[PDB]
């Protein structure tokens, strides 16, 4: 890879409540050993065979360690892993036609990072995604989520795809003609957005000033769009901005 940060991507996906589906997912009337075997074979053949075939469809830079049953462990270029996470979610949702959900954790590590710690950390992220519960009123976690590089960046799959990826696409399409001072301006935007929690007024003013400085190579309309996002959807905006910085980092790859 030529553009991005020289980082390995570790993906760990797991179907939510597959054991519950095997216990009581099938209605009691349609319970037989043949139906149970059909469901088991569907799941197993999907994971093993179809993950192989789907990753062979386009030359993803992935190095699948294990697919097996209900689980997944793949290591590759972090951009390819991030791109294939949504493809995996969509293909699983098609295959099950939205009867089972999948949780994933995506870790980002350097090449010489310990493999034991890669596995442990990405498992922790996958557990955090399985801990996803948007409202503290329901019973049992929603579990249909993905964790992005850190246990604080747990987003649902719909949230991830729609919000984060449309924001990342807009940022990419509006930030490609920035200067090398613009990169530092994006860094400052990220720092200000992270600090907004402990600085309500001065920090939003500083963000407005930074957008003012930027709105000469990005346009006034997108500066206003970023300002609106910062006051409405901040954590998604921070996620998209960090992903853009890591994807466009010119420190080899």
């Amino acid at each position: 890879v030529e553009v991005g940060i020289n980082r390995l991507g570790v993906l760990r996906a797991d179907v939510d409540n597959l054991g519950q589906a095997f216990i009581n997912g099938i209605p009691d009337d349609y319970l037989s050993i043949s139906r149970t075997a059909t469901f088991s074979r569907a799941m197993s053949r999907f994971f093993k065979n179809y993950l192989n075939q789907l990753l062979a469809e386009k030359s993803y830079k992935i190095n699948v360690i294990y697919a097996g049953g209900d689980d997944l462990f793949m290591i590759g270029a972090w951009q390819d892993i991030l791109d294939f996470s949504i493809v995996l979610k969509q293909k699983f949702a098609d295959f099950t036609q939205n009867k089972l959900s999948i949780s994933a954790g995506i870790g980002m590590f350097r090449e010489k990072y310990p493999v034991a710690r890669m596995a442990s950390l990405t498992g922790d992220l996958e557990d955090a995604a399985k801990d996803y519960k948007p409202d503290e009123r329901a019973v049992q976690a929603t579990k249909n989520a993905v964790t992005l590089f850190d246990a604080t960046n747990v987003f649902s799959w719909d949230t991830l795809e729609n919000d984060i990826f449309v924001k990342l696409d807009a940022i990419t399409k509006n930030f490609e003609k920035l200067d090398e001072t613009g990169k530092a301006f994006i860094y400052r935007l990220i720092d200000l957005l992270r600090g907004v929690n402990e600085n309500q007024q001065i920090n939003i003013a500083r963000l407005a000033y930074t957008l003012s400085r930027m709105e000469e190579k990005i346009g006034k309309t997108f500066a206003q769009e970023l300002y609106n996002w910062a006051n409405a959807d901040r954590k998604t905006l921070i996620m998209a901005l960090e992903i853009y910085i890591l994807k466009t980092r010119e420190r080899a790859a």
């Binding site: 940060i5 980002m108 350097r110 530092a184 860094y187 960090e242 890591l246």
Partner: protein, 207 residues
């Protein structure tokens, strides 16, 4: 039998230790500094201070002329000589936070540098995160007084290491103006046991 060497590290020119090569740190700056895991405040790891101090002491005690006075302070496990340690270093947290907020300033900064090609005269910028000068770090170093006849020489060597640090840097791009530190409020107090020669050890540290 156990002495506590207290003090403060005062940053003079901005200090850059370590690489926090995790997504959170590298997503906001090109080359981050080491932060506390939970509070995210800058710290001086005990390993960094210990290693730089040992390096300077080993240079100075040889000077082209390790040795026992270094192995007994920092330990050894090489092949047959195994001394455990006498100095027990601790991770040094940032002590100046309430003082730094009176200046309406963050504890860390980003230094904009560049390199200019000599064949093509083409420049190339780089950014390094750095802990701002004026930051203070209170440290405790624990000394295990195993020998009564060597404690004075060990503390003389400890003071020499601190002095060599004061005319050197602590972490990162030191020769390019970073990491200059000062030592203030250096004292030693006996934490466990009774030691009547603690006054001369304070005289060595207060020298």
């Amino acid at each position: 039998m156990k002495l506590v060497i207290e003090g403060t590290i005062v940053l003079k020119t901005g200090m850059h230790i370590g690489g926090s090569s995790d997504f959170s740190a590298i997503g906001a700056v090109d080359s981050p500094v080491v932060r506390d895991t939970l509070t995210r405040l800058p710290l001086i790891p005990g390993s960094s201070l210990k290693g730089k101090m040992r390096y300077l002491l080993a240079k100075e005690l040889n000077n082209g002329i390790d040795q026992d006075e270094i192995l007994r302070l920092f330990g050894s496990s090489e092949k047959d000589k195994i001394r455990r340690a006498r100095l027990k270093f601790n991770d040094i947290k940032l002590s100046n936070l309430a003082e730094l907020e009176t200046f309406n300033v963050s504890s860390t900064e980003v230094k904009f540098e560049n390199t200019i090609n000599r064949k093509t005269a083409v420049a190339n910028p780089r950014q390094i995160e750095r802990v701002i000068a004026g930051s203070k770090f209170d440290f405790e170093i624990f000394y295990n007084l195993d020998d009564i006849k060597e404690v004075e020489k060990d503390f003389e060597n400890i003071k020499q290491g601190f002095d060599l640090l004061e005319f050197d840097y602590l972490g990162g791009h030191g020769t390019r103006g970073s990491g200059r530190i000062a030592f203030e409020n250096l004292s030693v107090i006996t934490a466990v046991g009774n030691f009547e020669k603690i006054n001369t050890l304070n005289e060595i540290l207060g020298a």
